[PDB]
């Protein structure tokens, strides 16, 4: 509501830009930092002096490094009890988002405890834990099969903000679009 | 079992219960059946009063 | 945030809970006024336990017999009697694995029950194309621009 | 659900007002459509053109009458009370954003949310040519309502009078394709963001389908076995209605 | 119908014969008469009443869809129908009645296939 009109002031945007940052961290509320790049609070004021954090936070969920993430935070942010067990639930949103699409090319959504376990760094034991914590938030709608050790999942990835994702879908609409044609020269037929 | 009120089985190979019950469908051999009877006799009847 | 304890639950949650907490959950002050400390507890106990295979049954799958006594924290046996429980309320159906130690969230199935859901997946491409047509009579018009 | 029922008077009115008022060159003609639509449902049942007069460089530069919505829908009034304001009318063939400060004006008229009806009067559409938008809030924007035929007895029979499957649902499905391959194309151009969101969707929700397929043709041939019976049951009828004829056959011989 | 009294100055032709009619101006003047009846129509006026008849894609379809849901319940009611067709020519032993029976049957189930 903000950039476009009422208290373009700098002064506005400098304190509403350190509480997005704080809270972003405390929180795992909406999708990851997808959000960050989109609306400015490092490029209306300043890229550093506590927006140094931010860069290192992309970082830190692709990789799922513990260490980048203990660097980043200072002592205001750090000291509240809330974020370290949000920081978990960013880290397997973003992994999963990443090995679904990659997956994804006609309907395939069946992803091993092995690839989520991986990404996370943490064995499978902690996974099942907390992925059935993860579920229960409804940030997963798919479902675990214990014994089979398969994830078979159903959607529920966000899928938005595009550079990679649009060349895919233009190869998948024309392929579409030509399963689609022989059906309908069928049909003229007879 | 014999009275059929639960669809199990007894293993007397082992020394187990086990899952008989997925079940069945119903009405399909049985509404062939029927139509098919009526029809027959509709048909004889007709034949002989033609000739 | 107990009503929330019994959503997430894993059931190794709830003695920390109880114990920490019982400034009305033992007690009462403007209704019963209490019941019994120790009768109010085991009340509790039913639900915590009811409540942890009904969230199971919907978010697994398949789950190992000795996975799921351990959540619950009890004896195979006791595990077994609150799974019998349940099916027979019928708020949950499940199938049970006694000796290979697999429990099973499977109930009844037709062809036409996934039928449905094709004619769902149908349907959501249907609606999709009415969509599809607006947006595009949109589109265009920023597109001229 | 919410719909719209237009009378045919309606967008016969219509095809009347391009050619009545002499408007050419693709330009704005204007009237309002009246009818109920107090409640969700709305209820076309009568138009007028509205005096409209536009410039040919300028479509923000419009004139319009204000004074003689207010005055006719008096003289409405008078006549029937089934004839109330509900929206207004344009010959298409798209929106344009000088739609708004016309559908703005009409706004303060209305007991509802203002209802554009575009009626394109070219006749090179298919099906019914008519799209139904009624402005809310998004700046304001026009959003897509079903648009269907209306019905009274006297009237449908009338319609009749003055004139008296499959590979069409198909075919236009396949038409659908290619407009948003299209639309598509059009916007790589312009790029080198809805739009993309529901593209993605739609192909995550052939290839999911293919599964559920095979179970259908387990229940489908149980249904052409079905079929199968059924032509026999007929041919019983078809017999007895021969042999009736060659009765009667015989016993004209006869005689 | 279109009427319009007597009122002349054309219509002195009109209401072997020819007394009668120049009497019956002369004796009455205004008195009633039908008068003949034509359409006349425009092109596009003609094509938007027969396009009354993609919304038009979009409902087709959906009943389609729907259809193949409930068929399961649609089988079972059908098979019963015919059970009583069947047996009512065998005490029969009308025709046309028994014959429309059979026929919508017939006609349903070869839609029913089509539709998947």
Not at chain 4, 125 to 140: F, H, M, R, S
């Amino acid at each position: 509501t903000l950039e476009p009109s009422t208290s373009i002031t700098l002064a506005e945007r400098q304190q509403l830009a350190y509480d997005l940052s704080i809270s972003a961290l405390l929180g795992d509320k909406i999708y990851n930092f997808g959000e960050l790049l989109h609306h400015p609070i490092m490029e209306t004021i300043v890229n550093d002096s506590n927006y140094d954090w931010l860069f290192q936070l992309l970082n830190a969920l692709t990789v799922g490094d513990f260490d980048k993430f203990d660097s980043l935070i200072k002592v205001q942010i750090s000291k509240i009890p809330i974020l370290a067990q949000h920081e978990s639930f960013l880290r397997q949103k973003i992994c999963l988002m990443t090995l679904i699409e990659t997956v994804f090319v006609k309907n395939i959504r069946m992803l091993s405890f092995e690839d989520i376990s991986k990404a996370t760094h943490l064995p499978k034991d902690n996974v099942e834990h907390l992925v059935m914590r993860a579920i229960s938030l409804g940030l997963l709608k798919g479902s675990i099969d214990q014994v089979n050790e398969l994830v078979t999942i159903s959607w529920v990835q966000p899928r938005i903000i595009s550079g990679d994702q649009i060349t895919k879908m233009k190869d998948r609409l024309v392929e579409w679009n030509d399963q689609v044609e022989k059906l309908g020269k069928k049909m003229e037929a007879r | 079992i014999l009275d059929k009120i639960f669809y199990g089985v007894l293993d007397q190979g082992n020394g187990w219960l086990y899952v008989y019950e997925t079940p069945n469908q119903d009405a399909t051999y049985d509404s062939a059946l029927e139509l098919v009877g009526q029809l027959n006799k509709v048909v004889d009847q007709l034949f002989e009063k033609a000739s | 945030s107990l009503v929330k304890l019994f959503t997430t639950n894993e059931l190794m949650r709830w003695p920390i809970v109880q114990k920490t907490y019982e400034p009305v959950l033992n007690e009462d002050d403007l209704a019963f006024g209490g019941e019994a400390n120790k009768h109010h507890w085991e009340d509790l106990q039913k639900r915590v336990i009811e409540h942890n295979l009904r969230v199971i049954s919907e978010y697994y799958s398949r789950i190992t017999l000795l996975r799921l006594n351990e959540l619950l924290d009890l004896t195979e046996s006791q595990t077994e009697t609150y799974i019998s429980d349940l099916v027979n309320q019928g708020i949950i159906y499940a199938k049970v694995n006694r000796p290979a130690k697999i429990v099973n969230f499977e109930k009844p199935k037709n062809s036409s029950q996934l039928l449905n859901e094709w004619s769902h997946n149908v349907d959501e491409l249907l609606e999709h194309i009415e969509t599809i047509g607006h947006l595009i009579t949109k589109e265009e018009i920023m597109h001229g621009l | 659900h919410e719909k719209v029922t237009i009378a045919p008077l309606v967008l016969l009115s219509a095809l009347d007002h391009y050619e009545r008022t002499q408007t050419k060159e693709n330009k704005r003609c204007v009237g309002v459509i009246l009818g109920d639509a107090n409640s969700s449902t709305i209820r076309v049942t009568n138009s007028f053109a509205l005096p409209f007069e536009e410039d040919e460089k300028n479509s923000d530069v419009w004139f319009l009458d204000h004074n003689y919505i207010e005055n006719m829908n008096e003289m409405c009034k008078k006549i029937n009370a089934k004839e109330k304001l509900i929206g207004w009318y344009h010959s298409g063939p798209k929106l344009r954003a000088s739609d708004l400060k016309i559908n703005e004006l009409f706004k303060k008229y209305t007991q509802n949310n203002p209802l554009l009806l575009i009626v394109d009067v070219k006749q090179q559409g298919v099906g019914l040519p008519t799209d139904a938008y009624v402005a809310i809030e998004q700046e304001k924007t026009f959003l897509h309502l079903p648009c269907t035929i209306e019905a009274e007895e006297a009237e449908e029979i009338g319609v009749e009078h003055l004139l008296r499957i499959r590979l069409t649902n198909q075919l236009k499905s396949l038409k659908g394709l290619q407009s948003k391959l299209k639309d598509v194309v059009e916007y790589l151009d312009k790029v080198i963001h809805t739009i993309l969101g529901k593209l993605q969707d739609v192909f995550n929700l052939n290839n999911l389908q293919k599964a559920l397929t095979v179970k259908t043709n387990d229940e489908l041939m149980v249904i052409y076995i079905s079929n199968l019976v059924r032509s026999i049951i007929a041919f019983d009828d078809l017999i007895e209605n021969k042999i009736q004829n060659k009765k009667i056959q015989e016993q004209r011989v006869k005689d | 119908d279109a009427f319009r009294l007597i009122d002349t100055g054309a219509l002195i032709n009109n209401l072997l014969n020819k007394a009668n009619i120049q009497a019956l101006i002369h004796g009455l003047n205004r008195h009633y008469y039908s008068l003949n009846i034509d359409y006349h129509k425009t092109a596009k006026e003609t094509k938007m009443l027969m396009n009354l008849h993609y919304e038009e894609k979009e409902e087709s379809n959906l009943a389609a869809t729907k259809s193949m849901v409930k068929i399961a319940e649609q089988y079972s009611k059908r098979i019963e129908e015919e059970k009583e067709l069947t047996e009512e020519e065998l005490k029969t032993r009308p025709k046309k009645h028994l014959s429309e029976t059979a026929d919508e049957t017939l006609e349903n189930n070869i839609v029913s296939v089509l539709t998947a």
